[model samples]
Target: PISPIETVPVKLKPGMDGPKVKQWPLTEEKIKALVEICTEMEKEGKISKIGPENPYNTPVFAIKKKDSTKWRKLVDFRELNKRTQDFWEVQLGIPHPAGLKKKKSVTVLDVGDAYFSVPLDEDFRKYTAFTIPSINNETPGIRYQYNVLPQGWKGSPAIFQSSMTKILEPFKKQNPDIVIYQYMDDLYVGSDLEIGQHRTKIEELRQHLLRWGLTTPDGYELHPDKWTVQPIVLPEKDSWTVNDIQKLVGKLNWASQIYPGIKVRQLSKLLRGTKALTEVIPLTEEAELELAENREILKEPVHGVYYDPSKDLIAEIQKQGQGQWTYQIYQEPFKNLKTGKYARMRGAHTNDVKQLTEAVQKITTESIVIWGKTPKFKLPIQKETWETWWTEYWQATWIPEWEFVNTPPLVKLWY
Candidate 1:
């Protein structure tokens, strides 16, 4: 039998019975199916009938999977989540794109049923009691609760991620060259090596996974367009409602991880239209066009491009408005044509001793080639009085490892 990682256990706020919240009732047509699901779950020993130990009455829901052949049980966890506390406090941040660095080969692995991998701390199961409504809609259907860690609970991710870190810590130590990046349940094993070397590392990783019996099922490839989901019906002649526009935008925010480059900005118009969610608002043609553009982008064969560090770096600062300024850093797309017009590497839109300093601070951490052509940061000549500061920056700048660039005399009034 597989043992549950017991490092984390659910704990509720003192004196809390349970959280109160909304319950989406099932239709008479769907109730028959719901009963069958309840029977299946009861057989699996995940939940049970009313128990005096459980003082809570919460909502339960069943949603269809992407294929619609199976139903997934959801315990309206946000409610109970608000009433509980985590075993350990940890940040919700995931892997950073910049850290992928010079990797040539990469692939991601998803941990099957990551949540249930850790069983519920039996003592904490009472607060999670929920009910499946009776088909006749008479008495609140017999209450049921879980002994397994259920999905949608806030503390569940924290516990699961924290434990995975401790469990997988040894594997990382053993293989220093391969990068094992964990974002919740998704594990990304990558390396900067050629195909043969990368293949060996993946095989080694599979052995490590097997040792722990961590089940990883069929991969939903990183190809975002192929990501399976219930198909969204785009409105034709009729405009979308304000409430639905808000809901749609929020739901699609997760898709930002896939086709994340520019569609986010265009969708802001639809989000902004939700300013009056209560008031009746009709969708705009611009919003229609924006969503249409997003759909097309989502289906594009390549949603992500690998970052190459060989190209020369360039930072351009432009004034967005009188007060607001924007900074964009890119790899010189034409240098040896090494990188054909790639991404805007970094961007920021704030006013400070910025634009240059921020980008410089960032670039300093990564090694910059001494001989590669560094862009001349030609400055506008309006203010020659403070030109000495620019010279000082050049003299004692970020390239601590930098060899000298060809220098003209110091008389020029440019940075």
Candidate 2:
């Protein structure tokens, strides 16, 4: 059995509850310990600074699969993931795992170790948030960007991302093709070119990381289009078993909308083999008995219209709506091409919505790529060309003053 504390919470809430802020003298002791860790990090030149907004200086490890036991047992410092920040923006929700086959090329680069944050005083009390500062070793430059958090320390992700952003800024200046984005330890590399170029970039990145006292996992992979290689033995033919349902339910606390189609039958599965119901659903302490009896497996997916009252039905309506609107102009249709079936991306801008809708229908009907290429690769969100696109678009249209918000937020499609 899992430890009492380690057992799943009674009810999973959206976002994390911020780490307990220790009271005075007790807090002071924690600060002291944190300071010692930070001091060692600074001495080894592993700790660094990042911007104010991204001040959660935290770092996590990416160890070899064979050494998983050693890494997990060896690195148990601040128990960081234990303390979570509640009220994460809904936009940042991990609705579903991103599909891998979207990118043209795949490169797994592990960012382990390094300083994310340091304690203010000896007790390791109050972290300085995300805006930690650091100096450049190559030149007399000072910056506040993403860097790794000290190992076994709390708040590593924020610190690592902020510091590393600074580290990569210079390289970005020279090479426009290079794209780098890190959320905690997951570093995503996006490029519009071939595998050969990606390999070269990965090696250069490895070299830079070594200088900063960090390393990636060995047997790292580089492929075309898709890659998610976890070293775990499991069956395929994807189906969310009882374990998956339980895990997901525990992760997403609120049932109404956070999980659109959940019911009492699913909840029963969690408690079937367990003696204590309180262990699984902590927040439902008083109503535990009653909740267990409301075992009506919903026939229709219950519309979670009242999950959150503050912003309730409005969001639900939008969530269930279907939407489609984008500008697309064919290429070959206008100009002759070698592949008679192929169409080039020409241009399209009609003032009427009917025309726009018609054009979209034509696009779907023909099943052609909007920008010429057949979408050989799914594009990255913050592509390297994003900045360029943003700059040019704003310069051409001064988008700030213009407000055209016709589309609803989310659109769910029913099969």
Candidate 3:
């Protein structure tokens, strides 16, 4: 069972994470300077700072790590950098831990902008559309097909995310009273309407997608309960409709602002599928199932997170009227509670014991404490569990046999 503590009224503290970095969007003068230098290196066949891959792989801008000048590159996307333009934004019936209510009835729409770039070939292959660096004098790597390969392509995700955002923009503008966020091609659209108004907007949203370059492959008519929702048979009912993607059918839960540290780094690792647990729960296998399960469980669930703000805490909070409130708990994300390493959370924030104490105290006063949870100081395992749950079934304890079909496989599993 998920702890009632899953959702909390944490504040979006201002952190190093932001939209753009510093060194990106090279000016014409800088590009020329870099190109000249890189060209000389290419002639000598030695090395170069600027390269075809470098344009996309290079950092346009970034927030430096706290108290350090090193910038952790945003969205490690090496796999995305090598692909062709054949990506997709899939909205499956899945619910993020804090996002949607109908965990099961939830649909996930992951809009990935897949780009296939020319790969560097060993000997010689066709379609080296651009210049590249290699041994044999002037032979560039030939690419036949690459999918999701750019680690730092500035225009890649932005364009993809923006275009998809356009599909939903009309709906947003029409309502004018919704909160929508766009990070890459992942879009979240919603309103407070439960039955009629929200559904009407969804139907309009469906039309909006068709107007754009995208398509709502799921024919949305079977379930009018979702306003403009595509209908699928749901758990605990004959045929029900849900707005897992829109968040219209449910109450808002929680949002967490990531500071630059192991937590952020760990989440980034999970996103890139670098975390080992990610391998166990292949997205192709359980994403849909998880969405389905969440729907059945989270219908009108408690508005995520339980915060019994103490009078002092509330007074401090009101001082800013609309300021962020967050506490820094310096705890290892995954170390077992009784382990000595679990006490090392204080070091995560530069050994500032005050930060740790303040965070714990605030949580104790405002947030419910799950006393016996294991891996108290979060480790890779706990981090993975908290991060990759969009795939469904809560955990990666089960290995999945993936099939190449649109609709997911529904089967019984015993652990």
Candidate 4:
């Protein structure tokens, strides 16, 4: 065991009440499944019969498979994290295909009942004990302590992931070129090699887990059949409530990933209006058209997000119907909204600092030429009006802010 199970330590606070101990009535489906599974576990020495007074236990339940008679046993995992004094989170990193390149093909591989394979440490087994309720009315139910990991426990995913990662570490390194990623029990093998190479590599990795005593559960298929996808059926009239509309959105979101690049912008009408999931409302005309269109696309999904290395990248440049193209300057004043003022701006002829500096030097030697007229100030009549004109001309003729030069040395040093 490269990475043996390390069930995080648990010690519930003594003051807090233990889990609400009650068991509901069970049918033959529930009873037979629970009994048989526990019986198997008892034989495997994973669970042992125990008496009351452990204080921490929950009732077991059965969940039947969709298309099979086989069922899975379960227990409450949250009490371990919430009711306990301290514990680690169970969020193990799962790999994704977002960056998967346009390669040969992708084949999924799985280890069925992977979580149950890892054994719980002897110390923490009491925390995971469960009651198998009696079918006979008004009798005390039998109790059993779990020696193996229970379904839905937080520590199970973390421990099983760590152990499984180690199980395939050697195969992952040896077949370095093969592309593979594990999502807990299941592994995705994407290969750039020839067809069927992925399967062989998958087969090789399977043996490593097998040698380490990992196994697929009964009724779980090992070899995958060729993928066969069917048409999706949309919910009909008398449906399309707020909750149902959200379900439609979810399905579209799911399909959108598989069929990339199709625009569903029309869906905004349905999306933006809805608030109360409790309310029932009919979709608008455009929204209905969109729904019909989305259904059409799902009949045959298209466009995976992958790039082909063999294809050359596209490059292009266009002048776009040009004949000595030029744009006219509209130098006009724009009124300020807040200040209630109009201001005009003129563009400078010089483009950069060097050109501006050269012009500034010329202007420093002699002011920029402009017509600034003034009547000669002679006597009484001229004294008032002529003086006013002379002052205006002098102000006009003065150099416009010689600070524009921004001389490097002057900027570096200040008086």
Candidate 5:
């Protein structure tokens, strides 16, 4: 049974209210099963029966899992929230992974059924009522209400977060060595200290939780089996259907964004089949080999560059025609040096940086202004003195499309 909290009951605003009775169309067996579960929950003190005169009534339905035979009973309170136009703002400040620079190890703990762990006030319980069909017409009209905090309520997460903050404070105080990070029920305990120090703190925290009547479920296994893709497998060319080739091209495009070095520039040619006027070109043996080799290259780890928005300039690539692309490097919409505008190259290949610098030189004769707060970077764009320096800066600073694919994954605390 959940321990009840003495928090203030939820109040609805004037002209805002909940439904009276929202009925669901369910079979006899399904209704009986749902009712049975509710009945069990009531006996366990999780829910209780509410009076018929209660103003609020929401519909309930059973959820079927695709992978399993288990069915879950859920209440529909979205309609109530939608009508009321009430929403709770999240107050908890969660730290980002980029901020965790020193922590070497991380252990995440999830609180199962976290929302239901908090008890709701009796006054607010009536707003969470749901209806079910009467069995064999025995009972006239009946509805069950949740005594504990329900899952779908607008403010449930906020309430749980507020409640958990107080609950974990004492533990955090006692274990000063371990840094406590929490997002709702998922808690992370670790610090800038060495691996052993974090382990000691976690064990102490575990013991404290156990003594306090909270049970810690099984933790994650430290080491796991590993698998690697050595050789890539690609389909035979000229044998694929239009749909199959189209789907493969779509996936390859997605893969290209993730593994930019995979070089999917050729795979896009298959898309010509979808266009009515152009004949669908089949992939030759050479093209098929290239695709397979690209996949294999992605297996190795790669480091990428990040462009600072303020300091760096970006190129806008535009498609001109089949197998042709154009680029323009500019800061703002207007064409001025102070606001930042650069030379627009009409004919250029996507991969060639040499041609890009040549194009920029043609537009910039003496001094070109690259946008800053005020007029800045007044370096001569075309003079023989600054040509080498400007060319090197362009080669190093300009962000390539493949950098996005090679970026290291940020540590995500949430599962």
Candidate 6:
């Protein structure tokens, strides 16, 4: 039931129907398999025979999955993509899970065979022609083209999203209990209810797909690496080549969500260094400094640490009253000397020290016996030391980046 979106004719180089690229190496087995698959597709009305005079013809290739015996057909649309204009105007962005509430549940489904569901306009079909091996040596070569929107086409993603979004519009508006989110062909349904109630709503959405004739017999398998958390080692600026720097920009952008204190100005500077393939810009003092600081910061398991001079002062005062005062203040790795069960701190405000110090200073001389052990705690002596320490301290406590470290309790279903 999916419809095709119209597009302007692709502009190809003179004397060429598509990008100039070598065809897949032909063999008896591959040729026989290609013919079989194409024949089946034609029987299913997914493809059609094109006339010999067609002006456009792209090349098709096949690649096998890592452990599977199946060979998936792929089209060389690189040149065609370069010339194709925007097919759909909508942006495809998924929502972040940070907004989810504890009581809500989520279900995800993939749009298997998604692109083939949307038919191609008759006018655009001719431009998608690609040649396949002849059935026999005596047979003349003929061109075949997709009757539906084909994968590997640059605009296919937009077309699929546009069509799928339309198909789900009714459910989105009619169901107050279900919240839907779609990114490409992956559909996510969230509900503020238990799994029992959520399953019923998911079925209703599947029913809509069935009605549209877009549902596949076998449902989607969640990606193997889906929901798995991998360590994100911050890339080293010194070893970054042009391509590395470019990729780092994207990685850092994602990391910025966790490390919001990362400066945008520095990222922009790094991007400027990626203008050439071989060119690498020397890191500025600030950039190098930031890199080193971020590197050390990432080494810690905790997002940050805190110090409470006031708490320490009070503990000291109490100890002093008991004649068991120890000058050592509370630092990280806090716990029993043998058991190693330390109190993990979220973060501490730097000013808490001064506030506690001032509070203690207010204690009258009448309490001198208990407060006599008060030691001096003030700003650093060297201006550089003060600036560096303050910057790091503030950055550490700036935002609670540690929240993302713990895996979110996610319940994943196959469909």
Q: Which of the numbered candidates is closest to the native, going by highest TM-score?
A: 4
Q: On a 0 to 100 scale, what is the lDDT of residue 348 in model 3?
A: 42
Model 5 lDDT-worst window of ten = 406-415
Tens-digit lDDT track of model 2 for 54-94: 32333221222342222221132232334533223321112
Q: Which stretches of candidate 3 lie over 4 Å from their true place?
A: 1-108, 113-144, 147-155, 160-169, 195-200, 216-415
Q: In candidate 2, what residue range of length 10 has the lowest lDDT sum?
A: 394-403
Once superposed on the true structure, which residue ranges of model 4 sit more than 4 Å away at CA?
1-24, 64-70, 76-91, 94-123, 160-162, 175-203, 218-415
- Candidate order, TM-score descending: 4, 6, 1, 5, 2, 3
Q: Give the Å shift of residue 37 in candidate 4.
A: 2.0
Tell me the tens digit of each residue's lDDT in model 3 across 69-147: 2222133222223233323343111212232222112212223322112112211111111222233433442211112
Clashes of 5: 0
lDDT of 4 at 254: 51
| Candidates arranged by lDDT, highest first | 1, 5, 6, 4, 2, 3
* Candidate 1, 311-335: lDDT as tens digits: 4455333323333323233454211
Model 5 TM-score relative to the real fold: 0.41
Which parts of model 5 have CA positions greater than 4 angstroms off?
Answer: 1-6, 9-46, 54-124, 132-141, 151-154, 173-415
Candidate 1 Cα deviation (angstroms), residue 153:
1.9
Off by over 4 Å in 1: 1-9, 13-17, 27-40, 51-58, 86-114, 134-142, 161-163, 166-211, 223-415
State the weakest 10-residue window (summed lDDT) of model 1: 334-343
Cα RMSD for candidate 2?
24.1
lDDT (0 to 1) per candidate: 0.49, 0.32, 0.27, 0.47, 0.48, 0.47
Error of 1 at 311 (Å): 35
- State the number of backbone clashes in model 2: 47
